[PDB]
Amino acid sequence: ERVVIGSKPFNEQYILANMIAILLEENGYKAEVKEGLGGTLVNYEALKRNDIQLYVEYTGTAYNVILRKQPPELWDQQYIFDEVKKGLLEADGVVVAAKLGFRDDYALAVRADWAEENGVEKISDLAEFADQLVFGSDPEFASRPDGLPQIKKVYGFEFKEVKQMEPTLMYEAIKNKQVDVIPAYTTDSRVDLFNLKILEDDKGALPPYDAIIIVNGNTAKDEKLISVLKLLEDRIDTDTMRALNYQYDVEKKDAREIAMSFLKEQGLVK
Ligand SMILES: [Cl-]
Ligand SMILES: [Zn+2]
Ligand SMILES: [Zn+2]
Ligand SMILES: [Zn+2]
């Protein structure tokens, strides 16, 4: 049977989607990875109407963006997971099949040398400078309720200008001073490579983004399919994902091969 895997447009989405495809294919499915749908909302819409059967979402995204729930006073990872799992099920029959084992958080990043000069270590240190800085969003952060609107509300500042670009372009854009602040993805080692500095989210504005495989309700009836997805439960930690991402973004290796190498190493395929 046919299984189409969605993806948002960045490294680990391609890698994980392919990882899932290989495991499904090893268990009798014809799996494909669909690319270029767009972001969170379009992937979730696609999942609901069965254009895709499953994709890799993050808890904090599902909570704030998809379910449009209100930030608690404190972010608690397992609480957000529990509420996402219940809310997706209650709303659309969407099933959280598996936790992959890693967070890929939004984290605000600046150039390290600028941060060092200005004594900027945490997001509230940006307040002094924010109305002079250019923000380089990925396609979603600028407009998402847990993105800049959350930075605005919790820290009380907006940036001078907001540019949007594909996720992968953020890192060079800030390195080359086209922008000054980016919502870096914490599974992307180009933060270190390009000499950027993640700022502490000292007021806890941003939620946890635990990577989860979500499946639409009709597909989740397939228990064998579900059980294949669960082979990945907790199997991919942040350093593993960062390493696999590096292989994609810096080594320019194919997403399927990166996935296959990982699965072979882990004894998940022989
Ligand atoms: Cl996301
Ligand atoms: Zn000012
Ligand atoms: Zn590890
Ligand atoms: Zn072998």
Instruction: Name residue 20's amino acid.
Output: I
Note the ligand closest to the C-alpha atom of 133.
2
CB 208, CB 59: distance < 8 Å: yes
> Distance, CA 229 to ligand 3 centroid (Å)?
20
Binding residues: 8, 61, 131, 144, 237, 239
Largest CA distance in the chain: 58
Note the ligand closest to the C-alpha atom of 206.
1
Q: Residue 203's Cα: distance from chain center in Å? A: 21
How far apart CA 98 and CA 1 sit, in angstroms, is 20
- CATH numbers and ranges of domains, the chain: 1-104+209-270 (3.40.190.10), 105-208 (3.40.190.120)
> Distance, CA 231 to ligand 4 centroid (Å)?
18
CB 95, CB 88: distance < 8 Å: yes
Instruction: Name residue 172's amino acid.
Output: E
Token couple for 192: 């270190």
> Resolution in angstroms for this experimental structure?
1.9
CA angle, 66 then 70 then 71, to 5°: 105
How far apart CA 175 and CA 112 sit, in angstroms, is 10
CB atoms within 10 A of CB 165: 16
Closest by Cα among 217, 260, 216, 264 to 21: 260
Q: Residue 217's Cα: distance from chain center in Å? A: 22
> Distance, CA 174 to ligand 4 centroid (Å)?
41
CB 196, CB 175: distance < 8 Å: yes
Reduced 3-state DSSP string for the chain: CEEEECCCCCHHHHHHHHHHHHHHHCCCCEEEECCCCCCHHHHHHHHHCCCCCEEEEEHHHHHHHHCCCCCCCCCCHHHHHHHHHHHHHHHHCCEEEEEEEEECCEEEEEEHHHHHHHCCCEHHHHHHCHHHCEEEECCCCCCCCCCHHHHHHHHCCCCCEEEECCHHHHHHHHHCCCCCEEEEECCCCHHHHCCEEECECCCCCCCCCEEEEEECHHHHCCHHHHHHHHHHCCCCCHHHHHHHHHHHHCCCCCHHHHHHHHHHHCCCCC
State the method. X-ray
